[PDB]
Amino acid sequence: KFASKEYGVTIGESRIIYPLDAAGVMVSVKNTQDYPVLIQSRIYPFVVTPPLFRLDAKQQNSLRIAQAGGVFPRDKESLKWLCVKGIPQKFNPDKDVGVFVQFAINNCIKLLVRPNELKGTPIQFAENLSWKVDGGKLIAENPSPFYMNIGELTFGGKSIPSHYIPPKSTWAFDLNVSWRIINDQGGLDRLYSKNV
Amino acid sequence: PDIKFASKEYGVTIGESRIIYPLDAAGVMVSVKNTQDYPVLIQSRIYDENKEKESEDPFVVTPPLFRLDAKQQNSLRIAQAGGVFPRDKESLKWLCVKGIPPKVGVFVQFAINNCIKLLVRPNELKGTPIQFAENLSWKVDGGKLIAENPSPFYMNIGELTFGGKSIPSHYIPPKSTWAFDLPKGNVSWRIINDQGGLDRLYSKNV
Amino acid sequence: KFASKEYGVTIGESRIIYPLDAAGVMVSVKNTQDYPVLIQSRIYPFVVTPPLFRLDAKQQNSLRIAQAGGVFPRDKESLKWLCVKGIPQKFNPDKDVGVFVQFAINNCIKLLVRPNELKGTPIQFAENLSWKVDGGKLIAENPSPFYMNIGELTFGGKSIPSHYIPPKSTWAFDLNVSWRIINDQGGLDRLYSKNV
Amino acid sequence: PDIKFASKEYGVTIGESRIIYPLDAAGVMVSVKNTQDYPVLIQSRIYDENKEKESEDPFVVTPPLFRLDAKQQNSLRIAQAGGVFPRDKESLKWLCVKGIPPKVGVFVQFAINNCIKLLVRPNELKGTPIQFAENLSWKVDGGKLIAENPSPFYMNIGELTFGGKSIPSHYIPPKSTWAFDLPKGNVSWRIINDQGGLDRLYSKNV
Numbered sequence: 127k128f129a130s131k132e133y134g135v136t137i138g139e140s141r142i143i144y145p146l147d148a149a150g151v152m153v154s155v156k157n158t159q160d161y162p163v164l165i166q167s168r169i170y171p172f173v174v175t176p177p178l179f180r181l182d183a184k185q186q187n188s189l190r191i192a193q194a195g196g197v198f199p200r201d202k203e204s205l206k207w208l209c210v211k212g213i214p215q216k217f218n219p220d221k222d223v224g225v226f227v228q229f230a231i232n233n234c235i236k237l238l239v240r241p242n243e244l245k246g247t248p249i250q251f252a253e254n255l256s257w258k259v260d261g262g263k264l265i266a267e268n269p270s271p272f273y274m275n276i277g278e279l280t281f282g283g284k285s286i287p288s289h290y291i292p293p294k295s296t297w298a299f300d301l302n303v304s305w306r307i308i309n310d311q312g313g314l315d316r317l318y319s320k321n322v
Numbered sequence: 323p324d325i326k327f328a329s330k331e332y333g334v335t336i337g338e339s340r341i342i343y344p345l346d347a348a349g350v351m352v353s354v355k356n357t358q359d360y361p362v363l364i365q366s367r368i369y370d371e372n373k374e375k376e377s378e379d380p381f382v383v384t385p386p387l388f389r390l391d392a393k394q395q396n397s398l399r400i401a402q403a404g405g406v407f408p409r410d411k412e413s414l415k416w417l418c419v420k421g422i423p424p425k426v427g428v429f430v431q432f433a434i435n436n437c438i439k440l441l442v443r444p445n446e447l448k449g450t451p452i453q454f455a456e457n458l459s460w461k462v463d464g465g466k467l468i469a470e471n472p473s474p475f476y477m478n479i480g481e482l483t484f485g486g487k488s489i490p491s492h493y494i495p496p497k498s499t500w501a502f503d504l505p506k507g508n509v510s511w512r513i514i515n516d517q518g519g520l521d522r523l524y525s526k527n528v
Numbered sequence: 529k530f531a532s533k534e535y536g537v538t539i540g541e542s543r544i545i546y547p548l549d550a551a552g553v554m555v556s557v558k559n560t561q562d563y564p565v566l567i568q569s570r571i572y573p574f575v576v577t578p579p580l581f582r583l584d585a586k587q588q589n590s591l592r593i594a595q596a597g598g599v600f601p602r603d604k605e606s607l608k609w610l611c612v613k614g615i616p617q618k619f620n621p622d623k624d625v626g627v628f629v630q631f632a633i634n635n636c637i638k639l640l641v642r643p644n645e646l647k648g649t650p651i652q653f654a655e656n657l658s659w660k661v662d663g664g665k666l667i668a669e670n671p672s673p674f675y676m677n678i679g680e681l682t683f684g685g686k687s688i689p690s691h692y693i694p695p696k697s698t699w700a701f702d703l704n705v706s707w708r709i710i711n712d713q714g715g716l717d718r719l720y721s722k723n724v
Numbered sequence: 725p726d727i728k729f730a731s732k733e734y735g736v737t738i739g740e741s742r743i744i745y746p747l748d749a750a751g752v753m754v755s756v757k758n759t760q761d762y763p764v765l766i767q768s769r770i771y772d773e774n775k776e777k778e779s780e781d782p783f784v785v786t787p788p789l790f791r792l793d794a795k796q797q798n799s800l801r802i803a804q805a806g807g808v809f810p811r812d813k814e815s816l817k818w819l820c821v822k823g824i825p826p827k828v829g830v831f832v833q834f835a836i837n838n839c840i841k842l843l844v845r846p847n848e849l850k851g852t853p854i855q856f857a858e859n860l861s862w863k864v865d866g867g868k869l870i871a872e873n874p875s876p877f878y879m880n881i882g883e884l885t886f887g888g889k890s891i892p893s894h895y896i897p898p899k900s901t902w903a904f905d906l907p908k909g910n911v912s913w914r915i916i917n918d919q920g921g922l923d924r925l926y927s928k929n930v
Binding site for chain 4: 529530532533535537538539540541544545547555557558560561565567586590610614631633635679681689690710713715716
């Protein structure tokens with residue numbers, strides 16, 4: 127038998143905002159191990175540069191995200207994912223014998239694509255969510271041009287696993303509603319309540 | 323002693339998230355989220371790179387101890403319990419949230435200590451870091467590269483080279499300086515903006 | 529997602545021989561980590577001493593295995609298992625931030641109970657295994673008073689996951705036979721062949 | 725560099741297995757076993773605490789590289805490819821067998837480097853370690869506890885105390901000595917016998 131569990135939390139939101147129609151954006155990638163790693167980037171259209179490079183211990187390097195430049199919707203935000211993979215004399219039985227480890231790490235930040243033509247900010251629209259219940263699931267609708275990053279969500283005084291609400295669209299949660307979205311200062315915006 | 327396995331976000335960091343605390347606001351709230359599908363016990367605290375760990379911070383989080391169920395999230399409440407802080411410049415604090423087990427073979431337990439920057443921003447402060455990145459000046463002393471920051475903001479640097487050679491980035495504290503180590507014998511830099519992206523390149527000679 | 533695999537082999541056999549009817553035996557337990565651990569022992573009758581104790585980094589301590597002294601068979605060897613569990617100022621964001629680990633470890637050596645009255649050694653009896661096939665499984669019989677520690681086992685030129693063969697008893701394997709047992713020098717004894 | 729996670733058998737060692745190689749036997753065979761239910765790649769070699777790792781040993785294992793399937797076992801073949809070794813005393817070698825992968829989240833790989841003692845025993849040597857445990861003598865020098873071993877065998881010590889204080893055990897090489905570190909300022913010991921058990925206690929004054 128060999129078993130492992132991981133314990134920890136995500137703090138806040140992290141995102142890259144790509145302003146639609148910009149030649150591109152630059153993003154830092156820092157290796158914080160104290161050994162060399164091979165960094166490989168992909169997006170999930172857009173294209174990332176270099177698609178593959180070496181990073182020495184404690185060093186950082188920039189990446190350039192840039193858009194193929196095909197049709198994007200102009201009425202709303204879109205969501206892509208940037209994923210960055212990192213890959214890595216006398217005999218002495220106290221040094222040499224035992225268990226040795228290696229690990230590969232795959233990271234993904236949201237890459238948020240925000241058309242220049244779009245009005246205001248998520249905050250200004252957070253109240254305007256409305257809610258309903260269907261085939262057992264708690265459905266939320268977002269009329270907003272923005273993704274609504276749900277950070278606190280209670281239904282009938284009991285809290286529901288969060289998830290963003292795509293703009294001009296809907297999202298369906300598993301089981302009176304209150305919610306807070308996440309503001310552009312990593313923080314939680316104010317609370318709202320509604321009915322069904 | 324605590325056996326350290328990896329560093330941030332498992333050794334690979336994209337950009338840098340930050341939290342702004344508007345000085346003498348009653349308090350900010352922060353989302354915290356358990357990605358596992360099993361319960362996690364959560365311990366939160368504020369630290370300062372200039373204060374001893376055991377000692378208390380003027381700033382405080384709530385709940386300082388909280389069991390969080392599978393996939394669940396909770397809000398933390400950061401509050402300045404009346405410390406005294408400068409009006410003219412930013413102050414850096416760190417909110418850390420550590421997970422732990424709730425109460426033939428190996429059973430391994432990985433405990434993630436996740437810290438994010440708490441940037442204490444006086445409201446008597448107009449503009450943003452973006453508008454001050456230029457103002458950095460550079461100097462070499464006892465073989466260390468020294469950055470002077472005349473501005474009220476922290477310059478969270480994300481790209482640094484000195485004579486083509488890339489240097490392990492750090493921040494430069496406001497109205498203060500920072501000393502970088504060298505390898506061999508012109509300076510170029512980018513700070514990290516709010517879009518979580520990198521700012522423009524600037525260059526200057528020592 | 530979080531996943532881990534372990535890669536390694538068992539070398540040879542390890543056992544404690546308890547000579548039936550002895551006041552007891554002594555066994556070393558060494559902690560090879562460089563930190564303190566809490567050692568807890570159990571047997572799977574017999575009794576182990578201390579049943580629970582602290583062991584500093586690199587230190588060792590003895591354990592006394594001793595038999596309740598109830599009825600044991602005298603015609604053959606018996607098999608018990610000894611299992612030993614081991615349980616365990618300025619802030620600086622390069623030292624303090626990241627992933628930290630702990631692990632508990634549970635070890636089991638065979639505890640082989642060998643009556644004084646018993647003749648010879650496994651080696652002298654290794655040839656005397658005989659084989660058959662039934663409900664799809666490859667069955668081995670052991671007429672020997674000893675456990676036969678199978679270390680190499682091929683059937684129709686293809687190798688089968690090993691397992692000991694209890695004495696005056698039988699064992700059934702999943703799917704001409706050849707086999708080697710393990711001698712009391714950790715090594716592999718000679719090869720034999722039979723039919724069905 | 726290789727990132728070390730734990731030491732032997734994950735930090736908790738019961739007794740000590742050994743392998744005896746009868747000097748100038750053609751070769752001994754050893755069982756090796758994959759407990760996982762997935763394939764493992766196996767790399768075997770002999771080392772000497774007195775030779776450099778990269779350098780070749782007179783002794784050799786076969787196959788030096790072997791993929792072993794789920795739950796499978798294989799025999800290794802240790803052979804003295806005509807080195808020159810003393811007839812009068814034992815020599816210690818080490819057979820090491822390392823496992824490796826065959827060719828959102830973390831994927832972790834634990835690689836176990838398992839070594840067992842290869843005790844090269846001349847046949848011109850009657851008796852066993854058991855019959856010589858008594859012959860150890862002790863001495864204190866520059867604040868180290870020194871064991872003299874006049875015997876042809878390795879005294880694989882499994883219990884040592886000096887003035888009630890327990891000392892991290894080691895072996896004492898035959899017709900040679902060993903130097904133990906101290907903590908504070910009478911000696912008691914047990915070697916490890918063939919039943920994998922501990923021998924009788926002996927005591928002596930420096």
